[PDB]
Design a protein around this ligand. Structure first.
Ligand SMILES: C[C@H](O)COCC(COC[C@@H](C)O)(COC[C@@H](C)O)COC[C@@H](C)O
Lengths: 643, 549
């Protein structure tokens, strides 16, 4: 049983490293029997994962003429939902449902159970076909809002685009029924006999409560039915009114949303770490990413434990080395991390990719790495976990190399990536040989991730909040020094909104003292030579000359608040025109949506190309808010400067 | 030749509501009739009707609206001189403190009053320390936006307080001088005088309210004291920035009957010099004495030498009375073996266990406060605190018509208050609806249809924004026109504005997501001065419609 042979069975199988070593053992060096043994042992592997909650996955729709299918397939993480192999499975299932008009979920399940088991075998998450449904009508339309929401709509006397718009509406407004009358009339007469008790306790006349409940029940029934809902593309009119205008009729509709009605058992990363932990200067932000079973949480508890033991001391964890303070988050979800990054709730300086050496990279491991690329994480360090459960050291080298090449495929320095070979379990138990690996990993955090740049070390910048003309002295701007240092006698530029102007700092001032300089963090008045008050305005910045430029057009990564986060409750579309808040002021802009995106819902992550009415000092990384009349409804990060 | 909706709306907003008689009274009487209550026979009945604290909540809720709704109407013809009535009370209270000052500075005999003073003195000292700290004064001193002896309302903005030299009392001079020494900017004093200015503002139809307008530098330092007290009171579970605490405790008391709400009959003018000296550490008392105005000038030119420590317009009065009432209420609790954390205060508004009330009344008599038995509730189904009123858990907060209804904006305010009082979740009580629709007809046609959702002010009728023909969705944001006060720009004091800014920025279940986002927004706003002309304008604001069920 050579490492070379195990490798052979690996790329033929996709099964974990040790699974191959083992199966190549009880089958002798016979690769073919090994294939069969593992393929046979798949059933139990899938059976073991079967207890795992799986609330992620995809919705799929497909229309062929007047017959349409909508399908849900689940998994554990959105990383796996994005994976090509998972996607292939679901598309295959979907295609089979359409071709054989299969609407019985059990026939569907039973027909793909072998592939499912084989897919769970190599992906390592509990994957399941959940539900499947079909819809027919004169005209069929569909809308996918990413992977999460699928809609089928059947109509009559309506054209293709009308149906598409209705589907988009259904996706956003979730009607339960078509028309108010359709509401299970017996399910609301109990709620009307429940409601009028509530009302009739004030001692308020019989007639009053009944009459009020009746009126309440009427609009409650309106909002839950298509017909009664404000059309999302024109809220001043209901979908019912829209339909009459087109002499059309909605026949039926189906809305699936991934995970609908499945528990939703949230996780407390920090506490799970502390729990696990018990039974057993520069500030740097890091995060763990990797497969659900590969011990990210165990590793984190081992890190906190060993570092505390050795050095003494947004659900996050904290730990210190002699030279650094670390904040540590987990990255279980792609969309979730992207959103945290955009809003500034989270921001990695480095990532720790956790791979169990017992398996080696999973298929979704590229998705884990691709996330790093997408949010532009500068550095990735690898922790190879469960190394105590691996006998042959040359197999460890096999895994190492697989990881390095994956990293290089996505433009990380695979060949120069620090890779620690450790054991979170063994270190957490107290075996010193393994604790040494934890310390080694912390050594790499210290050495491989550069200390992020301090504001005081950046070129001078002060966002201008107000401008004054002091008789007998001259012009003064006020603000908080955002970065760098401004000294009396130095030249400055006034950047943004207007043509750039130049001036000279003739003084720096606080309420109690005149100063020679202003430094990052400090609130000050900066006196300027020559320039007049009416030549400056809020929204411009003071900067060291040449260090920042004004721009009108940029690419951005944007998060749109959900209703509950106090943002919008309706979607917007192509010509959305809100205010963009940069540092001290709102600026009006227009957006271009990405190719193929037509609707944006509250709670969405989305990239937009923004064009501002006038220029604004900015560079890559500048965060901004999106506003409607002073109310914040979104947040953005400038990703690339354009025109 | 251009009647845009915007011009049409402005024209409508600038008309007068034309009606015979007292419109306010007519609205209230139609409302009573619709609920099956007898109408007000005369203007005199409006202000002298008492409700009965029994019946179903429905019965009580309208009955209480009846007792309150015209309680504060300021345009009756009853010949009541509400200013003279106020000055009468003002002299009486001052005479009251005179007696208190003498009795309290006057020599085994045993007493609840003295015992509570002894206990409160010790507890206040642990809470607030020996003397106001430099750090606290540095953090909390500031100018307000109100009038001072040198600045009338139109010059009330803080920028004008730095721009114009303010007055100060003799004892406050050294504070100003210490301020002056600490900065290169110059701080000017207009005059040194021991007088504040006493005046009346409206309260209800029977009487005005007396207040004082302080010398501006005194105020500047009073606010420092006020700020420090507000911080320290948090250690007694009292948050003077949050009225909802008392509101909830009132509701609770109306259900459990274990909490009492106690109203103090404008005893914000009965806090005697003597009581403060007995309760406060000497370092604090000296400072309070330094910063108060010892004398007042009345509107008629006569002067007063104050027996009370200070009055409503002083920048530490609200906090000082909170401290004083709280400390006494908490000592009464200790004396009775009640938990003193059962005590909450918000200025005049006191909440404590119903069992403590009789003892509290005795202590209050002894320290020169006069408890209003009619507005004190320690049994029965009714409680009231901090603007909220409850009857057996039911919100029965009334609304008030304060002024002659003249313009469409006045009528819209009244109709919107009716809406908020008479709806549940946007659904009308049919009894009130009929009155609402009737009086809505008095509005110019366009303003009858121009609706906004609740929570957007009163520049338009609260209703459904999606049926508003004047609302316009532009770039996926809906904009709605609302009525505003028409204004004209004034020039700001340039140096005064600069000092205000420089002084302010140098004096210094949330999700992590919207917390970092909030950090983005700069909270300072440039000084901008306006004068309102009395006419009305129209402004488009961004609106979100009510959410679906
Ligand atoms: C000079 C200054 O920066 C520090 O103290 C000033 C002062 C602090 O309050 C002390 C308190 C009343 O016990 C008043 O001190 C004057 C006394 C000693 O008569 C007030 O500080 C607030 C200003 C400076 O914004």
């Amino acid at each position: 049983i050579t490492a070379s042979l195990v490798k052979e069975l690996r790329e033929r199988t996709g099964a974990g490293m040790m699974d191959c070593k083992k199966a190549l053992t009880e089958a002798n060096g016979d690769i073919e029997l090994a294939i069969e043994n593992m393929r046979k042992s798949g059933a139990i592997k899938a059976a073991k994962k079967a207890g795992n909650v799986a609330a992620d996955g995809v919705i799929k729709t497909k229309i062929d003429g007047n017959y349409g299918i909508i399908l849900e397939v689940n998994c554990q993480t959105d990383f796996v939902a994005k994976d090509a192999g998972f996607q292939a499975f679901a598309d295959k299932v979907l295609d089979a449902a359409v071709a054989g008009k299969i609407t019985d979920v059990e026939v569907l399940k039973a027909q793909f159970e072998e592939e499912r088991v084989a897919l769970v075998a190599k992906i390592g998450e509990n994957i399941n076909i959940r539900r499947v449904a079909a819809l027919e009508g004169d005209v069929l339309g569909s809308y996918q809002h990413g992977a999460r929401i699928g809609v089928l709509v059947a109509a009559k006397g309506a054209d293709e685009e009308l149906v598409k718009h209705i589907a988009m509406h259904v996706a956003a407004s979730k009607p339960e029924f078509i028309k108010p009358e359709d509401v299970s009339a017996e399910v609301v007469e109990k709620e009307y006999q429940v409601q009028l008790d509530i009302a009739m306790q004030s001692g308020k006349p019989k007639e009053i409560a009944e009459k009020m409940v009746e009126g309440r029940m009427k609009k409650f029934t309106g909002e839950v039915s298509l017909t009664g809902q404000p059309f999302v593309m024109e809220p001043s009119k209901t979908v019912g009114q829209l339909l009459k205008e087109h002499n059309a009729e909605v026949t039926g509709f189906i809305r699936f949303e991934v995970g609908e009605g499945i528990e939703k058992v949230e996780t407390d990363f920090a506490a799970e770490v502390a729990a696990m932990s018990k039974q057993s200067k520069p500030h740097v932000n890091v995060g763990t990413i990797g497969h659900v079973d590969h011990g990210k949480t165990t590793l984190t508890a081992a890190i906190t434990t060993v570092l505390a033991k050795t050095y003494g001391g947004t659900s996050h964890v904290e730990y210190d080395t002699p030279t650094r303070h670390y904040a540590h988050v987990d990255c279980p979800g792609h969309a979730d991390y992207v959103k945290n990054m955009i809003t500034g709730a989270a921001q990695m300086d480095g990532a720790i990719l956790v791979v169990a050496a017992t398996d080696g990279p999973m298929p979704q491991t590229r998705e884990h790495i691709l996330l790093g690329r997408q949010v532009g994480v500068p550095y990735i360090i690898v922790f190879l976990n469960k190394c105590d459960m691996v006998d042959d050291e040359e197999l460890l080298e096999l895994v190492e190399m697989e990881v390095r090449e994956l990293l290089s495929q996505y433009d990380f320095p695979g060949d120069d990536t620090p890779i620690v070979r450790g054991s979170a379990l063994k270190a957490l138990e107290g075996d010193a040989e393994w604790e040494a690996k934890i310390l080694e990993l912390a050594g790499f955090l210290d050495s491989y991730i550069p200390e992020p740049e301090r504001a005081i070390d950046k070129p001078f910048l002060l966002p201008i909040e107000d401008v004054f003309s002091i008789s007998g002295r001259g012009t003064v701007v006020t603000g908080r020094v955002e970065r760098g240092i401004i000294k009396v006698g130095e030249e400055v530029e006034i950047v943004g909104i207007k043509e750039t102007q130049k001036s000279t700092c003739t003084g720096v001032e606080m309420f109690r003292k005149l100063l020679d300089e202003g430094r990052a963090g400090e609130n000050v008045g900066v006196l300027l030579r020559g320039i007049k008050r009416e030549e400056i305005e809020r929204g411009q910045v003071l900067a060291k000359p040449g260090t920042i430029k004004p721009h009108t057009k940029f690419e951005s990564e944007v998060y749109i608040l959900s209703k509950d986060e106090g943002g919008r409750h309706t979607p917007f579309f192509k010509g959305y025109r809100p205010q963009f808040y940069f540092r001290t002021t709102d600026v009006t802009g227009t957006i271009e949506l990405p190719e193929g995106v037509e609707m944006v819902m509250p709670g969405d992550n989305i990239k937009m190309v923004v064009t501002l009415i006038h220029p604004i000092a900015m560079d890559d990384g500048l965060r901004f808010a999106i506003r409607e009349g002073g109310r914040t409804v979104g947040a953005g990060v400038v990703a690339k400067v354009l025109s | 030749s251009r009647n845009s909706l915007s011009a049409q709306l402005r024209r409508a907003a600038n008309t007068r509501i034309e009606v015979e008689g007292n419109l306010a009274l007519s609205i209230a009487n139609d409302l009573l009739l619709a609920y099956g209550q007898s109408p007000f026979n005369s203007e005199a009945e409006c202000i002298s009707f008492s409700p009965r604290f029994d019946g179903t909540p429905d019965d009580f809720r309208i009955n209480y609206l009846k007792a309150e709704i015209m309680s504060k109407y300021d345009d009756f013809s009853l010949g009541i001189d509400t200013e003279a009535v106020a000055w009468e009370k003002f002299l009486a209270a001052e005479a009251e403190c005179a007696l208190t000052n003498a009795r309290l500075y006057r020599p085994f005999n045993f007493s609840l009053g003295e015992s509570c003073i002894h206990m409160a003195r010790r507890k206040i000292a642990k809470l607030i320390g020996d003397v106001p700290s430099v750090e606290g004064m540095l953090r909390h001193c500031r100018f307000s936006g109100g009038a001072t002896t040198t600045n009338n309302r139109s010059y009330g903005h803080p920028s004008f307080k730095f721009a114009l030299p303010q007055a100060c009392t003799p004892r406050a001079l050294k504070y100003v001088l210490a301020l002056r020494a600490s900065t290169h900017f110059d701080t000017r004093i207009s005059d040194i005088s021991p007088f504040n200015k006493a005046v009346t503002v409206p309260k209800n139809s029977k009487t005005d309210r007396c207040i004082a307008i302080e010398p501006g530098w005194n105020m500047f330092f009073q606010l420092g004291i006020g700020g420090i007290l507000r911080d320290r009171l948090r250690c007694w579970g009292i948050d003077l920035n949050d009225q909802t605490i008392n509101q909830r405790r009132a509701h609770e008391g109306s259900v459990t009957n274990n909490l009492a709400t106690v109203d103090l009959s404008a005893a914000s003018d009965s806090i005697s010099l003597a009581l403060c000296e007995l309760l406060l550490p000497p370092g604090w008392f000296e400072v309070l004495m330094d910063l108060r105005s010892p004398k007042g000038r009345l509107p008629d030119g006569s002067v007063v030498t104050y027996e009370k420590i200070s009055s409503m317009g002083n920048g530490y009065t609200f906090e000082l009375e909170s401290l004083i009432f709280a400390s006494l209420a908490r000592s009464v609790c200790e004396i009775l073996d009640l938990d003193s954390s059962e005590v909450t205060v918000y200025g005049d508004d006191i909440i404590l266990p119903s069992c403590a009330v009789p003892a509290l009344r005795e202590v209050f008599k002894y320290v020169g406060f006069t408890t209003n038995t009619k507005k004190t509730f320690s049994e029965g189904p009714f409680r009231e605190s901090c603007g909220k009123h409850y009857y057996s858990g039911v919100d029965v907060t009334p609304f008030y018509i304060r002024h002659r209804i003249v313009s469409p904006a006045d009528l819209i305010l009244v109709l919107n208050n009716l809406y908020r009082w008479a709806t549940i979740d946007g659904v009308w009580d049919p009894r009130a609806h009929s009155v609402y629709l009737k009086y809505r007809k008095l509005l110019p046609k366009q303003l009858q249809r121009n609706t906004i959702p609740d929570g957007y002010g009163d520049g338009a009728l609260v209703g459904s924004v999606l049926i508003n023909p004047f609302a316009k969705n532009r770039g996926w944001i809906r904009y709605v026109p609302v009525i505003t006060d028409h204004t004209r720009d004034r020039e700001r004091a340039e140096l005064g504005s600069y000092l205000y800014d420089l002084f302010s920025r140098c004096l210094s279940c949330d999700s992590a997501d919207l917390f970092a986002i909030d950090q983005l927004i700069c909270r300072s706003n440039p000084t901008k001065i306006s004068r309102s002309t009395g006419k009305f304008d129209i402004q488009y604001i961004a609106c979100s419609s009510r959410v679906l069920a």
